[model samples]
Target chain A: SENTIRILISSDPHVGYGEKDPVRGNDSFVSFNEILEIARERDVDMILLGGDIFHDNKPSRKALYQALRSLRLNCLGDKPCELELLSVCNINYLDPNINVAIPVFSIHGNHDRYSALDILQVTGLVNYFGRVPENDNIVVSPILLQKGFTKLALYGISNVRDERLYHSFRENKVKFLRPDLYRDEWFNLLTVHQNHSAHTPTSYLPESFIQDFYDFVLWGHEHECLIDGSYNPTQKFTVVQPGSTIATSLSPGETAPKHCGILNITGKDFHLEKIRLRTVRPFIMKDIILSEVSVENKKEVLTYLISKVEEAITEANAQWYEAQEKPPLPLIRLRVDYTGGYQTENPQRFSNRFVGRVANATDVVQFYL
Target chain B: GSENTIRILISSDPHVGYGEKDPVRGNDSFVSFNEILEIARERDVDMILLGGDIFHDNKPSRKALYQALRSLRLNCLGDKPCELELLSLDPNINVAIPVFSIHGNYSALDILQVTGLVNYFGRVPENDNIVVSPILLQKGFTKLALYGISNVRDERLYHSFRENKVKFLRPDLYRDEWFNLLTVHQNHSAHTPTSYLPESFIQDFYDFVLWGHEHECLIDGSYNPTQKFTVVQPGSTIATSLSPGETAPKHCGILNITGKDFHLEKIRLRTVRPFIMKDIILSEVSSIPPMVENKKEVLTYLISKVEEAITEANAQWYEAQGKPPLPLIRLRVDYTGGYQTENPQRFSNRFVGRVANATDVVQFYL
Candidate 1:
């Protein structure tokens, strides 16, 4: 246990996200605060976050205030970092200005490439690394970390155009920094903020592009929950994809149970425990196919959709774990496909009755004609 | 009680579009403008006065225009009776809170004033004598004769004054008993030997002057013994540049003129972000000359020095409470004996994301 290094890993809290929305504007802010509170309670040595810390490249005043206040509250103070930093601090993006107890390290995502986290780094609020230079050779500046006898060569590459990153590797420009003394003894951990799955020919990074030398990979940019360390049989490296803390859109991926990971690394082995975030707004999505149902007219269609929406509300309400903290109105989304001869009802007017019942009433029920 | 005195809320150099795309402080100009307007509505000032440099860019961003338009319409529009009667105007003064401003070279500012929300003036004619026209105004008992001059080539104006080519056209129709005030946007500090407009240029007839063009807030302005007029300098509501002058507490004043006497009350704008600067001398810390050529130790020591400055900056920000968190800080490192300076971008990497002005947080001077 003394040789173990505990790291709380999360992604995309998107502080200041949806700031103008009345119902769920403050949702991401609350989720990020919860993440930091967990980091403190779990007694983690450091927190590793992957991108989209801010919703905007240029954040609103209140949003920046919230982030700085939260970071100052949780990451600052003289709590004494037990893990001795063996590598150069600047190379690891650590600021000497902070009396850091539990440091938070991050790589910029596509949403917040510059314009927000760059300023946060200056304040010594968070340690920022993972930016790759625009050059012929991709030299990976690895942070050599040590705790007791356990050591780690931590490599990070900030979000880059997947095709470019791929071509760089194809040309053999991607190189990793490994300790020449005990190469295999020190566990190799690499973190990246980019699409893991290919949406286009040039959109995502292939698993093969990752060097086989790494022991684990912290895959980000994908919002879906896949924290259960998945392994590639041939590559021999495990990947722990700790998805985003807040749902950005109404999609199957966004609906995945938001969780953070508590990674404990000892010797050359690391274990991860998925900690589900309670502060995330409960969102329930359902699909209704009118052709299969016994509904043909608009009135019957509305009634059937209402029943499905109510079920989702009850399901969302059921997900609440804390009793004293009454759950706010859940986000109910019903995708109604009226491929049959059915007239669609006005979604805006139909949602009038359920105004207080759901967070997104106006657009909760969508009709696909 | 409020009817007897003529109250005008004076603010200038808003620079709404200054840093619209900045990671933070983008909303500073918009927020600052709203706060000033809300103050005008709250205090129930008879009229709102302006200096110059309201729009940061000539062709302002749509968002910048939207911010100004919404704030103006929301706070400056109502059915309440217009107080101060303007004897001379630009246009659209038939509202509760009428704004009288001067065009400080913003071409697009010509786009607004016609909407009745603003009454803009101070257009200087090219190749002609600078004539100062008094915007005659009246409250219950106080008669205010306000003269205006928009921003012009300062050196040209200075030469015009030196040769008596400029004229202040005050109304001699009655007893020179009117509360005399003049507002001008010109360079007060000498950028060159004769570039600045001297106070000696204006006649001693004016009671007061509202000076613009200088970013420093001399809220309580210095009186000119020769000119014999009290000047109140209200600096920019938003900071365009991170410097000592820009860091001075930004304020919008409430000027109350009762018949012959007037007093300006400085109201600090709370929305502005705090900016602090510190000096770091490497010689003071690393006692030995040249620091023994250990590159690694040199960087480590430099880190310690800047971090100390960071600590000091945090305390300053804490002391100035209720401001937006994550204050802008600058550390000027005087690495006196060092031959080759550290790369600006390389040195800045350590402070990036931690301070507001990360890119220019530490300036190395050898």
Candidate 2:
């Protein structure tokens, strides 16, 4: 029996390749770096990156620089472990920041459409067979994690890989492409990126499939970190979506809840922890209704809102105090929806003054962390 | 004015049955109807030619009917000599002068046939009851052809209640037909500033176009300025919500025209506030500090500022005006780039109209 151990997995740190946020150095990059630092501190055995290195069809110069810089800071120095890239469309497999000696594996996520093309052989990003693992689309790889003796057969298949391959593999309700001819593999972990059968947004699965028999499964696409520890017929598939590490303004919806995933495996038990980053804040929507002529009521409501904000800030700061052995500072979301007709434009100015006033009221605070 | 001197006063887009205190009774509709009544009295308006959008919806609430009558009575109140029709005939003081109506947006075809509200009012009469038509030949304004049509936005939806040739509303559909005045609730292209209207409708057919549905008032010189097709959207008498500015137009417009031609006069209404509305945009750094320091002084300064703007505009009418001088005033502030992104706790209470989410975060390095 091999001595079992625990490892952490995360993916999607699409940095400068998406939106430009210089003031805070792009939230995605910040989150991704935080994820890496957390992993190092936790002393995980291995780290798995799902896919989507950048949002662009081609990586921009700024994006490439930020990506490499984050990887260098989080990857080098203290702890040593295996790093694998599970993606298809990307040309770059290994982080340029890595000193080549540290191994980085690349699987095909949707972004690596070029990997199947003849051009991938020429691009310097996708190096095959040299510190990079075999690029044979779907092949079984076995590794003994610190957990009990578990033969893990890993496979990565695509819906466009071949007509013969797709039809043979089952595409789940959510379009996760299942590997053809899945057999019993100890800790059989399927590392791929597609909407899972459970979390499928719509009924359409353009380029993915689903499978039933597997010990654990890793997925991508959705930009929020989630862990699906649900049961099938025989085994439990621990599915994860390591949301893109960076925010992409090109995409619709919002750029909050940015994060990475941690699949901790100790002995035969596995747990998923969603690590928070320094940049991401909690969301709160407050709507205050003013009766076009509520003079005293307006002041009362504004004052109440300020008091609530102060309490939350104190709580957040307190949490950080216990964690960092320093003073606490909380990340929050402030939303004010005031509906009414105003004779003069004074409400808007009052909104800002409230925030400044509260910050001043908290005064110069000391941190425990 | 002779006995047959038809004073064809135009009022439309009553948008009745809207903003009702109770949804079941549909108060908004009645509120608008009352507002219309107020306008009718102020102008000594007669034979009210409701351009269109007479009904707020196909089915109106009972409260709406009652409120409308209330508004009509108020319109005639305190005039030099109250009109004979508004003499409080009922002990409850509910009955007022009658207001004619035309079909508008909400009362298009299906709404009329499917909804039972029409039978409730017996309202749209072509001959004697209401006299809805394309050309109403008054003794003096008799030669002018005044068209009437409910907006034809969805033609298929208007299958059952579609208007016939006699009620021709579309200016282009009846350009070659006849008449001088075109009255309708159809979407007017030239007058509407920020709305979509049929692009191909020829606006030059009628000598004068009195229309409704646009809450704001608009008037342009006839085709040649001196000799033209006057398109007038007499803004609502009572302020309605489609555009709040109707009650407080940047300027007031009055047109006194005879059959010969017309002249334009602009009278900017002096906006008086009883309760002031103030909106202040505050950000944390430079702006917020100053506001917190001078909250009371800031409010006083704002009050005086609005008073100046209103007093300057109403200097001529000030001496003549008597009692109940102040109007309600409301103030608001819209702050952008919410503080939530910078500080979540601060964002929640301070940022009015913004959302604080888990993604809005700040960084700290020890």
Candidate 3:
């Protein structure tokens, strides 16, 4: 613990949507609390939330206030260091902690990538770093760096998430980000807030940049922690896309390994410790093999899936510990990827029964915690 | 009363309309009083101009009507029966006693058509003959004579009224008799109280210069007064706002007579109780004086203030009477200040009671 600096890499905690489990969704209010407990257990010094800290562009007032309250609780509680949330620029929202002096650092991600200079004018939120208006360096240290011990240089890029529109990897650089210059420096870690194929919507670091000098590329923008098998130390760099800290599964493809990552970097040996996120309800993705199932069995299968998911969410609802905290609904994604055409008037009608039953049966969606 | 070749033309009650208080004392009663005073005092004429309803209407607020008359008598006409100076274009000269006996609108019907009402001037053929005899005597005049007439019932009886050449307030079968003048209160052809008057009332008598109706006062196009026949209505001595159409004009006039030639000079009067009525649109009603909302207080304030103005205006006369000036119904403060008064009673209270006796009841017809 003497020489270790623990970092938490969390992505999108889209607060508005998703399943409610005792340990998941808005209903599973403790899911975030559960992650903090793990962070405390791991004794992480710094937290680097990739992007989409809040799922919705604009959260409801209740959700915003709840989030501010929760963050303040965790900051004051026994965490290893001051827990600062880095909300990438997506929507302009005021965190109450900013008023109460909670050390919160923010970066520019695609969702919040409108104007960089305007963001700087806003007080208590932005602390500008570099020469350019878009470029800045934010140094996070547990103790004040001893005069000039700028050990870890954090260079943030604005909206580098959309990675497809590029000629070369270097051309796709965030002007403010300069992890390239610090590549030879052993303590330096390159972090990118962009969309990657691995993360689908978030960008992946190109192979050339990884091969040059980056020891470990800490990434965000993607909602899943994808360990690309191509990232070998000899041919490429050790890139780890430790995705979101909250569940932001919009569709089947967006099913992420959702939780905060307790990254351990001690004297050159670094490994990711996953802090499993729980909402009030566990977002259960069930790909019903519709092609194999008969037409008569489809509705029954949907009903069974919905009922099962709702129970999981409801059972988890009672475990909420904080005020305004509620369990999340169990989002049962009934993936019926079948090529067979039916003579049905409404294909979505069958889907509605399951959605309706889950909504009525679950308490998490009813009370947005 | 000096008896030099003198002509004393005394006529009263010429009504004027819509006027302000300063400069040109007006169709308004108080202003009309000032106009009367100013003319009488300035010209020093010996004309006791008498007739009926110098103002057409019998209705003038007690204050405005009384103050106008009082101001004229007290200040301008000098409170005593005095003789007038008939100037020979030279300063030191004595002339005649011009005593103008005017019958008011209420009294107008009394004099010409005396129907048992002692003041009625109703006509009986015998009475007209009796009245015409002494009037044609021309007390101190050198040549021509002027007479007064009113509602003497039958128009056909005028032939007997002006029977002989020896006596004349009228000239029946005698046309060219030293220019006989008859001042009567009848609506002329071109000048009636309103546009709807019978043309027959003034059909034959193209010989006289008419004066009396309070509606209009003008020497019509037919008048040359000095030479030819004149049919004139020298407006009114006071004003009465009949309809909005006949809003009063300032009331003042002078008559010049030297030998056989006599002419009328016109002067318009100003309003005495001058007040500008304006309704300011206030999105917020709180700004109005707190007392304005209370109906009784608003009315009380209006009445007292108008009374105060008249009291100040006619302070001299009131001082003599040992009482304040009679109340008037002058400056009508038609207010839709707060909101348009919908209820008839409330509107009446505001329009009538508010400025009642204050200044001749600020008539709120609007």
Candidate 4:
């Protein structure tokens, strides 16, 4: 009836990538579950995954079971394929009844092995695409998708090394063909697993290089969310990088709010909304420099640290109140900058004194020097 | 008739009282001990060999004692009379799948052994340097010799050795025995490089030496150049210390001895919750630049890390199989030139996952 479609896009689920620590290891799945829950709640027409669906090329059997179970429970049904009749890519139909009652479309990331994803296609877990089995690094066949008058072309390739990716596209002249049926489509969305001009210092392809072919660009591989202006013309089209679903490490860049991109296409015009996930826990890093303090005055530093830590708790509580949820015990990391020579032979012994005093206040407080 | 071949389940350093305040962490020892018992019953071992430090401290909690007794009763035929009639004169003998142990450095063993929960075999006769005769047992036609040397203070043991007061108590008493198993609660050079018990001492006697006190599992054979005996050290069933070197798969050793030949198989404890040891050097991370600019930012960042830790644990355990065990996370942060905040407590109550005890989850250093 209407020439509009709503698509939910997320990437870097990294299903099995977490700490061996029992508590933190399941966090990746928790965030991934939250994304699916949101998709179910929004009742999107289709879901798109950028890449890195699994944390490793060979995911553990448990990881495979988890992925299969979640997909089966949340989004498996069959209506007629939405983008039928005119398609250029190989169509993997898992279940006849399972069509677009929220069909999942995805491309493999560097961490995924093609055979593992092929199992998903065989079992009807996901409508997997992008890789041409014969060629190593090009998406020669694009999936032409249509919902009512909204005609679109989706193209992608799994993660190839930067040099290889560049050569396959330019030096090797790897052709990304648009289907004849969707030449006049309203949008051509390209999903890629590579660094972009805005992020990396080198070996990143600028958006302008591919701007002529794709109406919108969605990316994975990088671990931070990058969103452009609201329907601005100078920006050409929309480019959305829905960073990692969960922070795999404690790097500075991972502090950004984790999110999934929601695309609403109305005829030719499409809008992307960044849906921030509430499941992501807060991470706080602080630096304290004590390079100039004398051995006798070291006690002052301890007192100062205690007071500062208390302040952080108060602030976290306030933020939780605003979010309308009960606050959780935060994990604190303190980087201590101390260069005083021979302040103490055993520094941990000096820090051990704070344990008794700070024991009552926080859940997990760590200090680094 | 085939009873001549007996299997012995050997484990050590349960450290039951290690973390009384934290149930998940504290319960690790108990759970591992139970798993060991289950293995014993399933494998149908003839007897159990426990090398000291069964309790983290000399004074174990009533709860710890209760758990130990209950598991032993249910798994090892508690309060049942000892079957090996050869040791009938010894009041500590239990006939029904006997459990033999000695006093570790941390425990006296006088309290629980009397309850018939386990057979305590080590005691000093008032400064007598004379070693004691081993407990004799029989399974069918096979004769077994079991000797025990419990743990004493390092200084006391050193004095005993220096004064020439240490006697083997007829170490050759079991020279004709078909199988001889010796259990000790002392550090051995085979298990620990800094051990006081030299390789020559173990080689002097015993076909197999089961030692404890080292918090890492080790299985080795041919420790002695002449004796050719197997040294099995089933490190701490639960990790009490957060050292990285202690990260071996916590387990119990299963000993199969037949006709003078002995084989040791390690059975990893699945019930023991996972422990993670990580170190953060503040100096190397300064260039990463503090993404946390304000109080809110810092608090959020801290909470996220806690959540991340918890989530990762839950996923790994649940994904593996069975119910996921609660995790014990230990992080050592070296704050040489690190972040300073007024309130470290702000990050204290941040884990959303199922954390039985979040008390000692993070250990900090400056």
DockQ of all models, two decimals each: 0.01, 0.00, 0.00, 0.01
lDDT string for model 4 (B97-195, tens) is: 567787777132443443334677765564336365667665555566777778865445545666677665443544565466777777664443333
Error of 4 at A346 (Å): 8.5
Candidate 2: where are CA atoms >4 Å away? A1-6, A17-22, A40-45, A73-149, A157-183, A192-209, A225-235, A242-369, B1-366
Residue-by-residue lDDT tens digits, candidate 1, B1-366 = 546687889888878788889876678788888888888888777778888888998777656766775677567743321111111113432235667777565233543453345667666775247887777776556788877888888778887888888887777766576888888888887858578877887788888888877778888778888888998779888778867788677778999888889988878776676676666676776543573564566567666766765676566555544433566776677777652356766777767767676677667776
Q: Compared with the true structure, what per-residue lDDT tens digits does model 2 show for residues A24-140?
A: 345555665576676657655445656554555554434444444444344433211111112100112235432221112334444542212112212111212111232233333
Predicted candidate 3 versus true structure: per-residue lDDT over A221-309, tens digit per residue: 76664633136556445666765544454344345435556666665566766554543333444444445656434556545545755
lDDT of each: 0.73, 0.40, 0.41, 0.62
Candidate 3 chain A weakest lDDT stretch, 10 residues: A81-90
Among incorrect, acceptable, medium and high, the docking class of model 4 is: incorrect
Off by over 4 Å in 1: A79-100, A199-201, A322-325, B1-366
For the candidates in turn, chain A alone yields TM-scores of: 0.90, 0.54, 0.62, 0.77
| Top-down TM-score ranking | 1, 4, 3, 2
Looking at candidate 1 chain A, the ten consecutive residues that score lowest on lDDT are A81-90
lDDT (C-alpha) at residue B308 in model 2: 51
Candidate 4, residue B230: how far the Cα is off, in Å: 62
lDDT of 2 at A301: 62
Per-residue CA lDDT of candidate 3, range B1-366, in tens? Answer: 454333333344544222433233333444553555555555655444545554344543323333433443333322211111111113442222223333433232221111110122323345334354213323233334455445432332344333432134344533344344556654444343333223233324334454555354453324543444565555554434423313333344465544445566655443333222222222234333442455544455554555564454454333323232232334445445543323334443444433323223344443
